[model samples]
Structure formats: C-alpha cells, structure tokens
Target chain A: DTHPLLGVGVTDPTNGTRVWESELDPDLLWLADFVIDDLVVLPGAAYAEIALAAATDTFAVEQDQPWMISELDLRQMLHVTPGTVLVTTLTGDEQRCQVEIRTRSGSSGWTTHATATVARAEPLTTADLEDQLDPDDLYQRLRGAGQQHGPAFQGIVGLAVTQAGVARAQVRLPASARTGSREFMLHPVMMDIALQTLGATRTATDLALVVPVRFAGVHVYGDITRGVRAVGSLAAAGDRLVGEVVLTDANGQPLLVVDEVEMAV
Target chain B: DTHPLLGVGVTDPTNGTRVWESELDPDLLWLADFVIDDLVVLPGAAYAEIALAAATDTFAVEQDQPWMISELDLRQMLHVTPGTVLVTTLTGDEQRCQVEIRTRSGSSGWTTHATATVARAEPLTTADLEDQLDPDDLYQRLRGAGQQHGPAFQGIVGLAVTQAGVARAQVRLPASARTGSREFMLHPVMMDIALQTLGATRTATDLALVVPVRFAGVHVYGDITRGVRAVGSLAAAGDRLVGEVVLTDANGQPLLVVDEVEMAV
Candidate 1:
C-alpha cells in the first residue's frame, strides 16, 4: 500500500530495520494552520500516524489480529520549516517493535522527535453511540464559545450529541486540505477531528478554550480512509476534561481507539 | 550531595543504576504558574535539572571535568496534580549514562516522561559578553509588550545588552522560589532565567510570542548557585531566532552551555 505522508518504505532485513522518509515544509496543507506561538508545529496526531504506518508495514504477517500502540512518546518538537525532511525508523522483532520519527534540515544530522512501541493485541470494541442533537447548531455554538478552529483544524464535517454526553461525528479531509499524497496511514487532521467530537458533548457551555494535554492508550486497528466516523464520551475532571474516542471506517469496523485523552480548559 | 528536586539517591554499584525519587504537587512555587491552556505542566527546564543532578551524582569521581547533557528528550507531559511521584533513573557505564524520568499517580504503574544522555566532556568556556543597554528599561519594555512572566518565570533579575545583540544578565532564584532543599545540582528556575535573558536583546520589538522549539548541544559544567550570570547571543533566521547561552557561577566559572536554542516568533 502507498503511504502518502510517510512516502516510500525501505526495509533492511540484515539489521531488522524499516524506514519511511518524507520531505516536509509549510506548504503541506494539513499542517499549514497548526501555528503555536507563531511557529508551525507538527501535531501529536501526526506522530501517531507515522508510528501506526511503521508498525503496519513491519508486521504485515500479523494481519489476522491487529497491532496496537502500547506506548507513544513525543520526544521533541518537529518545527515546520522549509528544507526539512522526516524519517520514521522501526527496529524490533514480531512481539514488539520500537518506532522513532527523526527529522533533518539543511546540513544538520537527523534528530529523533517521537518514539513508540507497537505490539499484537486484541481488537477494541465500543458501545453504540446514540446520536440526537443537531449538528449545525452544535458547530455554531462551539464557535460562539470561542472554540475557534481555523480552516485546516475545522475538520468536523458533521457532528451530533446524545443526552448522555456521548458524541458521534463524521470527519473527512476536504480535497483542498489533502497533502496530494496517500503515504499516511491516517492524516493528522482527520485524527484531530475525531477528537474534536468531544467538543460537541460538553465544550460549548465552557467559556475557556480546550486543548489537548496528553493521550493514553491510543490504539489503531484497521486501515483509515479520507472519511471516518468517531464516537466520543466526555466527562469533567475539575478544571480538566477526560474523554475517550473510538473511530471507525465506513463499514463500522473499529479503526482507532483513544482510550484516554486529557484536555485542559 | 542532596538533590532538592529529586531527593535522596540510591546507587546500585553492581549495574551502575542511580535512582532518585521525590513527591511533588502544585505547591512547588517554581512550578505553580507554568499553566498551558490551564493545565500546570512541568516545564522542560525541570527535566534538565533532574538529568543534570543524576549525571553529577553518577560521575562524581570525574570532578575535574563535569558531566554534560548531550541530549534530553521530553517523552510525555508530566501533569501537575496531587499524589504525584517522580523517579529519575540513570543506567550505563562510566563514560556515559542513560537518564530517564518516570512518574506515577497514586498506585498506578510508572510511566516514562523524559529521557536523556549525560556524558563526561571537557569544560566549556565563553568569551566576554559586552553590554550596552540598560537592564531596567529592557524589563519594562518586555512587560509593556504583554510578555508578563509570573514571579516564578521571571528569573532575569539583572540584564545588560550590546547593540550587536549580545546579552548578559544575572539569573537568581528568589527565596520564595527555592525548593527548600539543596540537593539539586542546578535549580530549574535558575537555569530558565538564564535563557530568559535572551528576551532582553531582540524581544522588545516583536509583538508575537516567543517559545522554545528545540535545544541542541546542551552542556552543563561546574555548580549552579542562586546568583549566577548568563551570557547570550541572538541572530535572526527568517521568522525564527537562533541563539546560544552560556551560564556561569558568580565567580565567572563556566556552569552550563546551551549551544543552540531555537525560538519561533
């Protein structure tokens, strides 16, 4: 399979190493609007995609049961700038593999920015997410409460909420937002949109801005397309919000499960 | 030697694993105000302190040449909350050791948040940092530009700058900011103040916020006291700023050298 975001994969059977390399810059549409403190930073979701793709390619024979992300650690910030190149390297055996995302600019040496571990695990399952609220109204209310996501970040194409604080949403990458390549296992923007479904349940009433602090037990199972469905449940934790999101393909098969996502308001 | 932040050290002479553990919460004054999107995340400087302290303890025999941090990577966000415990573990041979920071909440399993490599290196040196601008004026301007750092973040007690963009300043932790223990080789707050001096030179004019992107070739030598001096130089790289900082003891001996600090405006 062609991986747009990760580009071509190279395997070194002698040393048991697999690598995926890609050139990155500000022109990448999905990444153009992720400016933090006036600098473009590759979002954490992007690292998840790279690690997922590396695991999928390295452990293709273990397809009967999906490989799950046991741990993902963002080691360094991958600043978006011209003349930068990213390389994801995986080294390990069948039981578990170590994945690292490294980048280089100009004449500098490659520096590791993120790392993770992937191992075979049981497929995740989620309860049916009942939908009842109005999608358009929820989106408008979110904007009124200052949840201002830019064009690139505004990937929640459709959203609905249930009375029990469960949210279901459809997220897709607009043609304009595509990176023009399919090397990625999942686009970061789409993954971010899956998490954004949490906003529909409890965020519209809160006046403060909500941002991700850390994610735990994030597991990816099936292949991801441009469009997918996400079911999320949110609960308040003092000034913070803790939630879980389950993303599925169009066929309703579980694609990704974010067991714990902590956000600060 | 005591480590204020890490507490007591337990060394295993058999395999060369040095361990330090401490309990922490928001009451730690130096860490109280570092709120990002409303969550009190432990700053990167604190991790540097833990790694530096671990290196100092493990390589005490090499007193002539202090151990320096060759690489430090933040793997996870250490969320500030009640009942949090931090454990710093270092394992390796004499020339270099692997440093890892792990944390646990209540009775949960430990999770690694940060890691680094500390190695024996030659002492660092810096040329005289010529000064020309007034310290008070620079501080006032920074405050006027909406860069109001809370008491803990404001470590730049004195500042002087040259027209050529060289900055020199005194960075000291106030009595209120002290962790009340002298076990630390370098106070994270004090080290942060050294880098804050960079704001004196080029930050007065830029209206946009500035934050660290990455640190390269970071080296720490000698001991860090309350009233240490820091010398820094800045240069523009398009929309970004690239610079180096040299921190020293009050007696002018080299203490820590941050070879490169990249910040985006």
Candidate 2:
C-alpha cells in the first residue's frame, strides 16, 4: 500500500515524471494541533514527513528508502485553510530524488511551497541520560515564547539541563497518538518535543516568530511513539539558533537524530 | 496504508532499531518470474525494490521519498526454495539508512543477505528519442548469452545501436504484468528489460554468471508499465561493463533511469 501522504501515483506520459495528490484538511486532529504564532501552519515535521513519504514513493516511486532528507527549505508557509489541496511532483532516481510541494486554494492554480532532497543511506546505529531537567513549567515557558500547543502536542514531561545548553529529559506522545502512531511516520508533536530542546534552553528573549526555516539530517531511527527520551544541546549564533537533538527509547537508544537545526528569529 | 515490501514495523525496544519482516514465497508469480542462472534467485531489481521499500518504510519510513539507492551490493544469492521467509532490518534515519535482508529456513536463525542505502532527492525533470533498433531475436540472443527469461520477464522487443555502444530500443511489459503492475513499485521484469539494454548489446562473448553485483543511481522516474522505450550506452573498462540506461513513455518521456550498472563476469 502507498503512504497516506502520497495519493495514487500516475506517470506523466508526456515527460515521464510523477505526481501524487493528497488533500489537506485543517480540521484533522493532528493538523489542527500544531498552532504556531497565532496561525495554524503546517509544522516543519509535517513537511519532513510529507517529503519523506513523497521521496519514498517517488523513488520506489509506489516505490522505495531508508532515505535521508536535507536542504529542506520551507518557504511561503503552507498556511492551513479550509479545503486546500496539494499536488506534489517529484523527480530524480536513487542517486538523489527531488521533492516539491505545491498547494492549491480551492480550484486555484497550484503554488510551490516546500522543497527538499532524498538519498539512500545505511543504518546502524544514541542519546544521553542522567542529565536532569529543572522541572519547570516547560509548556508554560513555551506558551510565553509563543508556542500554542494543544494537549496532543504537549509531550514534554521531564526537562532538565545537566549542563548549560545540554539537555537530557523524557518526552512522549499523548497516549492516543502513541497507540495511533502507526498512522504517522513520526509525529509532529514528538518532533516538536525534540526540537523544543532548542527553544526551551535558548538565550534569547525576543518574541519574534523565527520558525524553523531550515533543517539538516532530520534522521529517524526507531519509532518514537513507543517511548522517547532525549539528549540535546543548543548553540546560539548570529541572528539564529543552532541545535542538535537525539531521541532514544527509555533505554537510551536513538529513535530520532537531527544533527543540525536552524530557526531564524 | 503501509508499503507492501515493508512488513509490519516493530521497534527493538532494547536497542531502538527498527525491523520490518516480509514473508517470501517461491510460488509467487512475480517471484518465480526471475530465473537467474537456472536458479530461482531474486533479481537484482527485486533487491533494489526491497531495499527501496525497506528504506521507504524505515525512513517515513511507511513513512516517505523521491529517494535514491546506491552502494547496492547483492551479496548472498537468495535462492528461492519453498517456504523461505525474510526479515529485513534497517538502521538509520532520513540522512542515511542501512538495509539488511535476512533469511530464515524452517524457523532457522536469520542470515543477512543483501545491503544498500537510501536517501532523498527533489524532482523537476530525461532521455533521447529518434533512435531505432534492428529487428532480431533479442531474447534469442539473450538466451544465447545465458538469459533464460520467462514470458513475463521478456520485455525486449526491438534493439539497435544508434551509434556504437549507444542503444535505443522499444520495450514493454507483457500485457498482464503491465496491467497488474500496480502491485510493483517497478516490476522486476520491467527493470530486467531496462537493464537488458546493457547485456543485450554487450561486446563480450564470455559466458559467466555475472549478475548485477552492484549498482549506482538506480533512479526511477515516471511509471514504466504504462508504456516503455529506452535509450542507453555501454562502456567496457577493465573486467566490468559499465552501462547507463533511461526508460521513457511511448512518446519518449523519461521513466526509469539507471546511471551506472556493473555486472562482473
């Protein structure tokens, strides 16, 4: 069976490319949960999943991956509205495949939204433990920082920094999402929980909406919904913050690993 | 829904790695179609499909791609005996995932068979037209060259050299496989036909069982089952013959493109 994000595939008899269509509905529970900056926008993790799914099918093409994603640039934010649809077109082969996300407003002409690449890699494989979090009101802190997360998206449990900018903590999906995780490659909320490490320990106080405009090596290993514990560190550079996070099972084995992430303010 | 080649996913809670197990049977029509060297061995294209399927699920892993596959080494020949089951273990995330196919004999311990890597890419897009083939018994020639292709695997219709070592030909999946092609990401027979562009026009008369030992850039474009045409070039350097082939729709649009394929004798 094809991935949920990827619709039925059809080959372009004219040029020999491929297109997969999937409808976008804002009312969906998970889509509705990721509220960012007073707007219900598609989460970065959603784009990652969508792109990964597209790449998986595009390359196997209904077809293949333990494909890695990079050069993920989410532009012209996919502002969620009623009845929007997506026509994602992909090109390339196993050496590398390109991903494109196009959106349509009602019957409007499709517009480009996001772009990324997928390639093959070998797996083998991490995280830290014993570093405690200062059990602060993490979501409250996130709320103050402009993250409007619903209950399904609020997965931060224990948060503590063993060292400055180094975090070792527990995170999880809501019980329902955990059981329903098969529906998601990796839940956006879980990723938000992992990326939360960066903003939670940031040194900036400005309230500007500097979303995740770029990402690198957002690699997923095991299923994070079964359970999640994380170790991450953050570094603030000029006009942006850089973070690296690794999620693991309760035993401290890697579930998701993002080598470098950037969110501009 | 999950991709078919990828079985139900399970996380190794202890180590945080992922495993997808799919049962393999010899009686299966498509599985039985590929007869390599008088043995019912899984085709190299099957490994690519399996790896892509494994990588696809491992990364979106059910989950994502326009992905790519490379460093694909089909090590142990998976001799198809009745009742052999396969458990595929994948390690890594989107950045890079390693694929391993293990076999179990009658509840036997699993053994690793094939390995590869998958990654993501973007799309835009492929091949040339305006070349014709000499009408000869290509399969007869292939049979002479040790390729005992069953009817389903025999897609080679017309073969010709536009120039020395450059090939342009017409290919097609037999009607039934073409109609039932939705079951495959890319049919192994179709891929066999595409890769056949290389061996069909090979310069060597050496009869050695040099199956596709390794491949690079096994990129898939549009669906080939709709219709098939191909343009390819071959170069022999040292002990291996390196070849590149691109498939397109009937009107000459790009479908599947393999940049470099090596089958050592």
Candidate 3:
C-alpha cells in the first residue's frame, strides 16, 4: 500500500529516538521524474514527507492537532541504488520533534541526508480574494510556459489572479496519489504542487518559468484532507520571485502557512 | 518522444567539445524507482547512457563499429528539482571521448556532476556456457531476493548458471522502452538490467540480494538492437562481489564488455 512511502512504523516514541525504515529503489513509480544528469536525485519534498509521516505517527493523529513543519534543511545528496533502505528517526517531545532522514546502501551504516522540525499549532487563517481564474484556462497557461506537469505534479484544480501580484488556487492531492493515511498534515507532493501557483503567476503574465529555489518557512496549522485551496501573494525580489502561500480547506479554514517561498525565473 | 532522456543533440561533432542538453524534473516516468531518502538521485547507469549517447552522436553510428564505455566516475551527486537542465559534453578524438555531465537549476550556472570516457573498440567475444537455468526460474529467484524489478529494470529473458560463480542471460530492451533513436549502442536501461545477473547469482543459491556499489569499467564493441545475451562471471571479494560481464548477440557476436562490477550483498 501507499504506507510503504511512510516507512514501516515507529519503533519507540518514548525513547526520544523513534526510527522508521522503508525500502528504496530506482524503480519506485512516483520517483520516475526526479532525474538529474541521467541520475535520480531524491526530492527535498520527499524528506518533508518523511518528517511529516513520523510526526503524524508519533503525535498528530492521536492528539487531533495539526502537525506543522516549521523548518527543513537538506544537507546531503542521497543517491539511490538497488536495495537501498531509508531510515528516518524522530527525536523530541510531544510539543516538537526533530526529524532526521538517513539512508543506508546494502549493509553500510546510515548517512544523514536531511533534518527538520515538526510542531503542533493552532488553526491558521487568511484573507479571501475577490478575483479568480478558470481552472481550465490556468492549466492552459501553465502548459504554454513549458510546464508540462505530469499527473503527480498537476494539483492546482482552480485558480484566480486576485490582483497584479496575487493569486489563489484550489490545490488538492488526487485520491490516487494519497498514501492511505488520514493524518492531518498535507502530503509533501501536494504541498509542492500547491506551490505551483507562484509559477502560474509568472506564466499568466507570459514571463519565464519560475522554479522554486528555497523555503524560508512552512507552517501547517490544521490537518489537510483530499482537497484544499492555496492562496499565494507574490512579489519580484532582485533575481527571484518571493511569495507567501496559505492553504485552506473547502470550508475556508486556514490549514497551512507557507511564510516564504523563493523561486528563480 | 523518449528522446528527452537523450538530451539535446551534439552542437558540433568535429569540435573538441560536444554538448547536449535535456530538461529535467522529478516526474520522469522511467526514473520513478530511483529514490534515496526523500530525494531522487540519478543512477550511474544513466551517466553511462549519456556517455554512450554523446559518443554515438559524435562517431561510430556510420562506421559500423562498437563504441564502448571504457570508464565512468561519479564526482558529484545531482539533486533534481523543478526546471532543472542537464548538460552533457564529450571531448576527445575518434579513439576516445572524455565525457562530463553537468546540471543547472533554473537560471543558475552549470555544475559538474559526473565524468566518463567512451572509446571505439573491436567486437568482443566470450565462451559458451554448458549449464542453463530457465528464464522463468531465474526471474522468480531474483524476485525472492527482494529485487522487485519494475518493467524497465527487468531486462533478462533467459539465464543459466554455467559454472561456479558464472552466469549467462538473454537481455533485451522491450520495444516500448526504446528511446526511438537508432544510434546502435545498447540502451542504458538494458545495460543496467544485464548487471542484474550478478544479483541473481546470489539469489540462485538462496543468498541475500547483492546490490551494485561501483563500476570498474564497461565497454561496448558493437551496436545492440532489441535482443542480446549477457554472460557474467562472479567472485567473492571479502564483503563484496566482483564480476565481469560480456554482452553478445544471439549468434555469439560480442556487443559489450562490462569489464568490472562491484556489489554488496
């Protein structure tokens, strides 16, 4: 099942070192597009998934609180080979968890690839926009910018250019893309797809394709289910486009606050 | 359509530097299984593919000679992101080409990720094996070793354990997997799949799966079409398994020489 992406399970939550394991190979279906220089390089968003999965398994599901990712840092490049195993360990208390993602090749010792922090938070809220764009038209605009998003990357279902530098879109994880877990935090793939609004902003204006370069902060306040709307406000920054994104449920309840997203055009 | 993986064509084959370009993202289909940690790391076999592609585009296709991969070294780990561009350049004479692979994120400058060498070679030859294993049985054995190869990774059609630590298998690149290029050299996926025989060697005896760690050398002597037989010899190297593989057509004509392969069980 999709649980395979979440790894096996947590060994011990009380020991302050909760470890989870998952098998990795170059043939995993969802990873087909993550190639660099003829090689596959795991995406940072996947690490965010690992961190969120560990946090959900440890605290969020039972507490019924939103597990928000406060910060994530990718330190090492993990090259996937056949028979690779990813081992993720979470260490912290109920208030927060320090997540570290590591991988071992064959029988080798584990090497840390990424580290992040997850914490519980109150429900987030954001302002509503008056303008909106048709989903069909937005999708066409993205395609015109050479953004040939395959199924997995196409999560924006509805959108509207609220203003000159502001946009809002309905972003959701396709049921087929779900990991079979009902935990509250948004899946990393969904989150990454939601960020495409920034790209749409550039393409809508006939500018070059904008690629995300870094994240200053991402905070989730409520659990995200199948469909959620992401509202983003963008501004040109020197050589990059900077944006703040807010994810909300169908009921208009804020679910996530992406404080800063930096992208190169 | 599949030419995306082959990157852009050669700028000038007669020049000392031959460069090619390919757009990259984390959603490429054939690369779905190559995940490490949360990111996708390109497989070394892909680098081999780039080297071979550049070599064939520069020389050998019209000469009717085998363009071989002599050696390859992965100097950096390439992390794939949205809007990444892979640039592969080959520099050398007709006898050999020094291959280098680089990548640029969005509008950033290019960074080298790998280097390799390709050379022209005479047809290779190998001895016939006396023992043979049913293709069905070999495939099952590989599966039992936790080597769940996806369609693209499953290249063996037949196999036989000819002698102690020696194995031979019929390998083919399914028409569906071809890149639509008739350049003649073995497809990288096919070549990588041929290496699976080494893993099959351990599993045939009920041992754990052996995963490739590094390559000492891979040489090609002639063009490879859809079908070819690969013969491999293996030996125990302390904690690793070392082997040599040769690929030949059904008539026993040498096509490729994988001089050395190192793996861990």
Q: DockQ of all candidates, in order?
A: 0.01, 0.01, 0.01
Best by TM-score: 2
Better of 1 and 2 by TM-score: 2
Find the 10 residues in a row with the least total lDDT in model 2 chain A. A8-17
Descending-TM-score candidate ranking? 2, 1, 3
Q: CA shift at A26, candidate 2, in angstroms?
A: 2.2
Model 1 spans > 4 angstroms off: A1-265, B7-20, B33-39, B56-65, B75-77, B105-112, B124-148, B178-181, B203-207, B226-228, B236-240, B249-252
Task: Judging by lDDT, tell me the better candidate of 1 and 2.
Answer: 1
- Runs in model 2 with CA error above 4 Å? A61-65, A106-108, A125-136, A202-209, B1-265
Docking tier of model 3: it is incorrect
Assign candidate 1 its CAPRI class: incorrect
Query: What is the CA-based DockQ of model 3?
Result: 0.01
User: Could you tell me the TM-score of candidate 3?
Assistant: 0.42
Model 1, range A153-203, lDDT digits (tens) per residue? 766767777656778888776666574546555667777778778877754
**Residue A189, candidate 2: how far off, in angstroms?**
2.6
Across A4-42, the per-residue lDDT of candidate 3 in tens digits comes to 555664232112355566778877655644444445667
| Candidate 1 chain A: 10-residue stretch with minimal lDDT | A9-18
Give the DockQ (C-alpha) for candidate 2.
0.01
| RMSD for each of the candidates | 23.9, 16.8, 18.3
